[PDB]
C-alpha cells in the first residue's frame, strides 16, 4: 500500500480543525513548535514520501498527522506545477509568493471538505491559517533544495515529471 506519516505514532499533538500542528524545523515566523534539527520531521517525511505516494490511487487516513501529510503532498504537486523552467532564485521567490497568497482552508473552495473538519471556533480558523502559511512556506523552501540539488539554473527533470502526477486525483 501507500506510505503513511511516521508522526501518526505521536500523541497529545496540538491540533486545529483536524490538522495536526506537528513539530516543524523552520526559520519562517508562525505558531509551529520548533522540531529537533537532527531528526526527520513532517516536511522531511512529506518530500521523502511524495514521489512514491503520488503514484498510488487509494489511501486510508490514520489520523490528523496523515491529514497534514496529505495537505503537504497536494502542495508539493502545486509547487512542481509552479516551478517549471525557473532559475533556483526565481523559483524561491515564485514558490514563496505561492505559499503566501490567499488560499482556501478546510471549512471554506477546499478540495477535501468531506475528509477535513471545519475550524472548531472563529479563532481556530486564524491558528489554522497561521500554521498552514508557515508550513507551506517551509515546504516550498525545502522542496527547492531537492529539485535544484545537482544544478541551479534549471529544475531537475527527475522532479518536474511529477508535476502532472495528481495525488488521488485531487489538487488544491
Amino acid at each position: 500500500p501507500a506510505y503513511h506519516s511516521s508522526f501518526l505514532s505521536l500523541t497529545d499533538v496540538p491540533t486545529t480543525g483536524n490538522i495536526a500542528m506537528l513539530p516543524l524545523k523552520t526559520k519562517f515566523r508562525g505558531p509551529a513548535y520548533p522540531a529537533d534539527e537532527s531528526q526527520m520531521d513532517i516536511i522531511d517525511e512529506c518530500i521523502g514520501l511524495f514521489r512514491a505516494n503520488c503514484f498510488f490511487r487509494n489511501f486510508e487516513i490514520k489520523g490528523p498527522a496523515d491529514r497534514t501529510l496529505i495537505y503537504g503532498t497536494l502542495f508539493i504537486s502545486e509547487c512542481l506545477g509552479r516551478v517549471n523552467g525557473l532559475n533556483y532564485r526565481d523559483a524561491e521567490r515564485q514558490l514563496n509568493s505561492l505559499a503566501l497568497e490567499n488560499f482556501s482552508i478546510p471549512g471554506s473552495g477546499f478540495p477535501l471538505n468531506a475528509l477535513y473538519a471545519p475550524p472548531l471556533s472563529p479563532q481556530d480558523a486564524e491558528i489554522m491559517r497561521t500554521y498552514l502559511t508557515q508550513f507551506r512556506q517551509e515546504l516550498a523552501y525545502r522542496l527547492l533544495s531537492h529539485v535544484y540539488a545537482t544544478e541551479k539554473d534549471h529544475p531537475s527533470k527527475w522532479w518536474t515529471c511529477f508535476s502532472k502526477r495528481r495525488f488521488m486525483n485531487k489538487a488544491l
Binding site: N96, S97, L100, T133
Partner: protein, 370 residues
C-alpha cells in the same frame, strides 16, 4: 516593525507599517539664525529643523532641502532623517526596515543618494522606494484608476489598470503648493500688502491653507467679486494687524487650471489628466474616467473636485460617466498607502536588503524597486 516615511517637499509624514495615520507630520524644513545672538548661554545651537525652526521663523532663515521633489541639500536632508528617527518616531533606524516615497520621472541620482545614506549612515536592515502615486491607489483600496497627486513641489498623473502602470502615460507638472504660495505672495502686492522674508512665505502658506478655494467658473467669480464684497474674507498676521483677501482667494488656486498665471506654457491639471487618459489604450479609458483619485495637500482646496469634474466632463465624450475620488484623508493617502503596502505579507520578499546592497552597490534600487 517596519518604518514608513513619506518624504514630502513641504511636509515630512512618518510612522510605522499598519498604523492608520502618520505618528509624525512636520515641516520639511531646516534653518539657521540671521542675527548676532549676543545674549549667549540660553541653549543656542548652529541649526534647527521642523516645528522648532517654524516656531522661531522670525529670527531664523528657513530652507527646504527638497525642491520640486528633488533633494537639493543632502546635509539638510540627513539632518531631517536623523530628526525623524531620533526626535519624532523615537526609535533606532538600524532595527527598522524603512519604506520611502518618491515622485515619478525623478533624477536617478536622487534615488541612489537616498539609498546610500540609508545603508551607510542610518545602518537600516532593508529599504524600498515606492512611486508615491501607487500608494495613493493602495489607500483608495482599488486596482485601477488615474492618480492625481499634487503635493508641495510637484503635481503628477499616474494611470494604473488592474495593477499595471502605464509608464508612457505617466506625466508630471513642476507646479504645486510652493508655486501657489509664491503666486499668492505676488498677487497680495496688488492690494498693497508685502511678504518677502522666509517667515512671510510661511505666513502666506498659513493663509493659503485656509482662505483659498477653487472657482467652479472663474469668470463668474471674477464678475461677482467685481460687483460684491461677499467673496472677501479676512486674516490676522502674527504681528497683530489684519488683512482682507478678495478675488486673490480663488485667482491663486486657478493657476492649476491656468499655469500661464505664473508664466508657464504647460497644460492645467484637468487638461494633463485628460491627456494622460488619452495616452492610455482605448479599452482602459472608461475605467480611468470612473477612477480619478486625488491625493496630496494641493488637492485640499474647497471646490477643486467639482471643478475637476466640470472640466474633465467638457474634454471627454458626452456618453460616459466621470467621477473624481477625493477622500478627506487626501494629505496622507500616500503615507496610508505606504502603511498598507509595507504591511502586505507578499511585500516582505520585495524589500531591498543591506545583505544585497553590499555586493550590488547603490544601483540595486533601480533593478529591485521599479
Amino acid at each position: 516593525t517596519a518604518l514608513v516615511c513619506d518624504n514630502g517637499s513641504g511636509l515630512v509624514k512618518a510612522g510605522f507599517a499598519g498604523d492608520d495615520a502618520p505618528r509624525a507630520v512636520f515641516p520639511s524644513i531646516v534653518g539657521r539664525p540671521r542675527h548676532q545672538g549676543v545674549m549667549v548661554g540660553m541653549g543656542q545651537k548652529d541649526s534647527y529643523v521642523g516645528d522648532e525652526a517654524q516656531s522661531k521663523r522670525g529670527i531664523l532663515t528657513l530652507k527646504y532641502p527638497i525642491e520640486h521633489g528633488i533633494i537639493t541639500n543632502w546635509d539638510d536632508m540627513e539632518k531631517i532623517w536623523h530628526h525623524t528617527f531620533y526626535n519624532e518616531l523615537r526609535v533606532a533606524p538600524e532595527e527598522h526596515p524603512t519604506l520611502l516615497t518618491e515622485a515619478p520621472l525623478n533624477p536617478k541620482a536622487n534615488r541612489e543618494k537616498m539609498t546610500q545614506i540609508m545603508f551607510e549612515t542610518f545602518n537600516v536592515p532593508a529599504m524600498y522606494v515606492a512611486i508615491q502615486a501607487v500608494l495613493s491607489l493602495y489607500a483608495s483600496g482599488r486596482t485601477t484608476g488615474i492618480v492625481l497627486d499634487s503635493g508641495d513641489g510637484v503635481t503628477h498623473n499616474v494611470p494604473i489598470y488592474e495593477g499595471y502602470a502605464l509608464p508612457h502615460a505617466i506625466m508630471r507638472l513642476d507646479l504645486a503648493g510652493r508655486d501657489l504660495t509664491d503666486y499668492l505672495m505676488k498677487i497680495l502686492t496688488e492690494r498693497g500688502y508685502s511678504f518677502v522674508t522666509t517667515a512671510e512665505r510661511e505666513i502666506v502658506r498659513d493663509i493659503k491653507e485656509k482662505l483659498c478655494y477653487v472657482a467652479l467658473d472663474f469668470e463668474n467669480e471674477m464678475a461677482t467679486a467685481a460687483s460684491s464684497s461677499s467673496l472677501e474674507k479676512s486674516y490676522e498676521l502674527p504681528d497683530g494687524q489684519v488683512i482682507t483677501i478678495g478675488n486673490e482667494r480663488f485667482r491663486c488656486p486657478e493657476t492649476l487650471f491656468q499655469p500661464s498665471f505664473i508664466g508657464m506654457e504647460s497644460a492645467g491639471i484637468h487638461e494633463t489628466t485628460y491627456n494622460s487618459i488619452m495616452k492610455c489604450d482605448i479599452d482602459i479609458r472608461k475605467d480611468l474616467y470612473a477612477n480619478n483619485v486625488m491625493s496630496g495637500g494641493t488637492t485640499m482646496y474647497p471646490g477643486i473636485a467639482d471643478r475637476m469634474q466640470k472640466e474633465i466632463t467638457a474634454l471627454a465624450p458626452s456618453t460616459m460617466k466621470i467621477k473624481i475620488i477625493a477622500p478627506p484623508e487626501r494629505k496622507y493617502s500616500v503615507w496610508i498607502g505606504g502603511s498598507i503596502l509595507a504591511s502586505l505579507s507578499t511585500f516582505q520578499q520585495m524589500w531591498i536588503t543591506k545583505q544585497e546592497y553590499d555586493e550590488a552597490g547603490p544601483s540595486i534600487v533601480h533593478r529591485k524597486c521599479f
